[PDB]
Amino acid sequence: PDFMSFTSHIDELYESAKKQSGGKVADYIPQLAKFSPDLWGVSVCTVDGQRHSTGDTKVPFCLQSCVKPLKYAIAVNDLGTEYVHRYVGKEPSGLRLFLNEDDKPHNPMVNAGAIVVTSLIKQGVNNAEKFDYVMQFLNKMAGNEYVGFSNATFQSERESGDRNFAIGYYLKEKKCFPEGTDMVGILDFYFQLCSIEVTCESASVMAATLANGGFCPITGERVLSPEAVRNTLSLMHSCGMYDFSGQFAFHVGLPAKSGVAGGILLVVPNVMGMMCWSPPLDKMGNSVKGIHFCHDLVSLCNFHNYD
Amino acid sequence: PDFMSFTSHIDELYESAKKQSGGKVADYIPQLAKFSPDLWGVSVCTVDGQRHSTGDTKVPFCLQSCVKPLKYAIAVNDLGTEYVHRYVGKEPSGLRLFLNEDDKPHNPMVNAGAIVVTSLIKQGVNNAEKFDYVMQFLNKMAGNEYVGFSNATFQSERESGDRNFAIGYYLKEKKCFPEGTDMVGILDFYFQLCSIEVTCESASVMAATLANGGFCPITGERVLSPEAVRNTLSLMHSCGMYDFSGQFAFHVGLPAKSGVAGGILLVVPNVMGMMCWSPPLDKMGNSVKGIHFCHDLVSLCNFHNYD
Ligand SMILES: N[C@@H](CCC(=O)O)C(=O)O
Ligand SMILES: N[C@@H](CCC(=O)O)C(=O)O
């Protein structure tokens, strides 16, 4: 209704979350540990293309696990729900290395499922063409705003990702991949996808595309099928916030996805997309200021699923 | 928009689910095993008070686990979210006897959590007054339509409920109950609540009250607080369908609760309530015809959360 007055409220919510200085910046690679704890930005993009930013909204950071819903959406878009879910389940595990009763990863939002989803995208071409394909897809989702790549993050991520290699070999042993998959090459592609860089501004438009039925709000183009969008939102609602996913569903009731860079990709269906970013993470791996901001936003604006 | 034409579609969906003859009638007590497999009814009550029934909609059956959301709602209504959730968690387990990391039952929809919720209601009075209190509450939810009691079910349920006694003593040992709780008397009250009888017709109005923000649509009275209703819908969405809850959330995306009598209490927020009932259950414990009907209903009418 009144965007300028909604904007004032976002700025007050921003300002209250800012005083919240707890948490620890991820440090398992130097490219994460570098980041200032005081960095804090929130960008909004409505379903009608209205924009508002406050704080550090033009500083690039890596999507990390925030890319998981986006590549899941790409796979469902290209391949359909049924094909994708031959390989990956549709529900939460407890707690956030094992497979479900059908020897599938529990869902696309845990590393095992994201690694499997990565193996399904653009099969038969080399990694450079797979990567370019996804990069172009994210450009459409972002209405051609900032989408980059951190080579330093990619190289450290691959050198230090012992757990992800253990998962890969485990998935190989349980036959979780499509026929003819080079698992080690899939891990590389996965590491690369984690290392894609956005700003709060550009990521908010990606979230707005999900909020707007798969149409990008600042270009008007259909980027994702209705089915892709719907599946992605369902899984972001139940599985997007690591071991906090249940509590977030209860108290906030919006589809969101967090990552270790401190991003929270938030969708308010039929209203807007947002990206909140602040490096310091709580014990569950979620941005301290962004979790605070999300609780406040739903209280103020009555955006809960079952409001 | 056009109720009479919506009604025709419900009848076609009813008719298609009817041909679905799989499943097994529960038989762990004779009061369940008695029931014909061919019994099948669907009742709708809209948020504006419009009614439609098809099939066996006036044959009483026991709420069984369908009562779980209703007593959880009563407790939050009387005591608030914060008090109730000192005792019970807010999220799914995997798979559907243990407690969460805080030694609480995972949520109100598993037996352990429902037993704890039962211990919180109307504390300090005797069981007859507790029971009368809840019966009167269900009368308000149902707009004074059919609410009864099966004494035969209550007596068999208590004689044969070895698992529930094991849970009770386990909860007693982990200190899960409020101070001064008679655990064995709480189990009785729990058995009694399972044995409350409704028809599809009367249960649909209970569901419509949840669909309508806690106001009963055929009387207009406020029965439940906004908070009670919202909490209940969140937990029905994630935890209401036993081990099928994840898949139901994905494919159907509505708050529902199933029970072993073959009932499915379904809420379509801001639109309507329904009760589907058919005794024969699938391997997960859900009504075969009602699961089929629910999938079909969401396909036809676009009622999914993230449609
Ligand atoms: N690259 C990290 C992603 C961590 C995250 O964003 O949670 C991993 O694969 O473990
Ligand atoms: N009285 C049954 C309820 C079963 C159900 O409806 O799932 C029990 O407590 O196990």
- From CA A119, how far away is CA A177, in angstroms rounded? 7
Q: What residues contact A97, with CB distance under 8 A and at least 6 apart?
A: A112, A163, A166, A167, A170
Residue closest to B267 by CA, chosen among B297, B300, B307: B297
Query: Dihedral (C-alpha) A216, A221, A224, A226: value to the nearest 10 degrees?
Result: 90
What pairs with residue A256 in β-bridges? Answer: A266
Give A64 Cα–ligand 1 centroid separation in angstroms: 6
Cis amide linkage into residue B39, ω under 30° from 0: no
CB contacts of B255 in chain A (<8 Å) are: 306
Give A67 Cα–ligand 1 centroid separation in angstroms: 10
Checking DSSP bridges between strand A51-55 and strand A41-46, what pairing results, if any? antiparallel
Which of A230, A245, A247 is nearest residue B304 as measured by Cβ atoms? A230
Which tokens in the block code for residue A214?
């798969």
Residue numbers after which chain A breaks, C to N beyond 2.5 angstroms: 96
Please give the helix or strand (H or E) that residue B265 lies within, else none.
strand B263-268
Probe target for ligand 1 pocket from A157, A159, A187, A189, with the most ligand atoms within 8 Å of CB: A157
B234–chain A Cβ distance below 8 A for any pair: yes
Contact A237 B269 (CB under 8 A): no
A82–chain B Cβ distance below 8 A for any pair: no
Contact A286 CB / ligand 1 (< 6 Å): no
Question: What Rg, from alpha-carbon coordinates, does chain B have?
Answer: 18
Phi, psi (5° rounding) for residue A196? -70, 135
Cis amide linkage into residue B266, ω under 30° from 0: no
Question: Chain B, 35-74: which have a CB under 8 Å from a chain A CB?
Answer: none
B247–chain A Cβ distance below 8 A for any pair: yes
Query: How many degrees, rounded to 5, is the angle at CA A161 between CA A156 and CA A162?
Result: 140
CB contacts of B82 in chain A (<8 Å) are: none
| Minimum CA–CA partner of A100 in chain B | B94
Contact B92 A93 (CB under 8 A): no
Does residue B302 come out as left (phi exceeding 0), alpha (psi in the -120 to 50 range) or beta? left
Give A111 Cα–ligand 1 centroid separation in angstroms: 7
Phi, psi (5° rounding) for residue B282? -75, 180
**Do A287 and A274 form a contact (C-beta atoms < 8 A)?**
no
Buried/exposed A84-108: b ≥16 CB within 10 Å, e otherwise: bbebbbbbbbeebeebbeeebbbbb
- From CA B98, how far away is CA B116, in angstroms rounded? 13
- From CA A25, how far away is CA B186, in angstroms rounded? 47
- From CA A23, how far away is CA A264, in angstroms rounded? 15
- Determined by which method? X-ray
**Do B278 and B291 form a contact (C-beta atoms < 8 A)?**
no
Q: What residues contact A186, with CB distance under 8 A and at least 6 apart?
A: A115, A118, A119, A168, A177
DSSP state of A178: P
| Minimum CA–CA partner of A107 in chain B | B246
CATH architecture entry for A1-307: 3-Layer(aba) Sandwich (3.40)
CB contacts of B237 in chain A (<8 Å) are: 249, 305-306
CB contacts of A92 in chain B (<8 Å) are: 92, 94, 246
> Do you know the residue count of chain B?
307
**Do B293 and B44 form a contact (C-beta atoms < 8 A)?**
no
B171–chain A Cβ distance below 8 A for any pair: no
d(CA B241, nearest CA chain A) in Å: 13
**Do A256 and A241 form a contact (C-beta atoms < 8 A)?**
yes
In three-state secondary structure terms, B160 is helix
> Do you know the residue count of chain A?
307
d(CA A105, nearest CA chain B) in Å: 14
- From CA A89, how far away is CA B6, in angstroms rounded? 33
> Could you identify the residue written with the tokens 């059956």?
B61
Residue closest to A59 by CA, chosen among A35, A89, A87, A83: A35
Q: Which site among A250, A267, A295, A303 would you substitute to test the B interface, given the most B Cβ atoms closer than 10 Å to its Cβ?
A: A250
- From CA A94, how far away is CA A4, in angstroms rounded? 42
Resolution (A): 2.4
A307–chain B Cβ distance below 8 A for any pair: yes
- From CA B235, how far away is CA B108, in angstroms rounded? 8
Contact A230 B269 (CB under 8 A): no
The residue extents of the domains of chain A are 1-307
**Do A278 and A262 form a contact (C-beta atoms < 8 A)?**
yes
Buried/exposed A53-78: b ≥16 CB within 10 Å, e otherwise: bbbbbeebbbbbbbbbbbbbbbbbbb
CB contacts of A247 in chain B (<8 Å) are: 90-91
Contact B91 A253 (CB under 8 A): no
The CA–CA distances, whole Å, from A261 to A44, A297, B68, B291, B302 equal 19, 21, 40, 41, 36
- From CA A214, how far away is CA A302, in angstroms rounded? 24
- From CA A18, how far away is CA A192, in angstroms rounded? 31
